[PDB]
Amino acid sequence: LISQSIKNLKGGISQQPDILRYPDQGSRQVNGWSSETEGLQKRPPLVF
């Protein structure tokens, strides 16, 4: 029984197929803000 942790989430799309791609790379990501210390965040809003 194995396990592993993906430490960061930076980041973004990787349209390369999933047996090739790195960890930290999601398959889609909308309105995300992969910062340095904090990972995924919402992008800050549009004031008017």
Added chain:
Amino acid sequence: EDIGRLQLRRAWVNYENSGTFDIYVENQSSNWKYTMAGARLGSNTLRAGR
């Protein structure tokens, strides 16, 4: 590596020629304080005034 539960026990701090820091160990609800003073009994450093 954060996979299994690391049951922690008795961390230790070594120190050069000074002292009297305390130490505050703070769990969720415990709050133990490990106060410390200068030298051990019978040491040549521990004096009745120095």
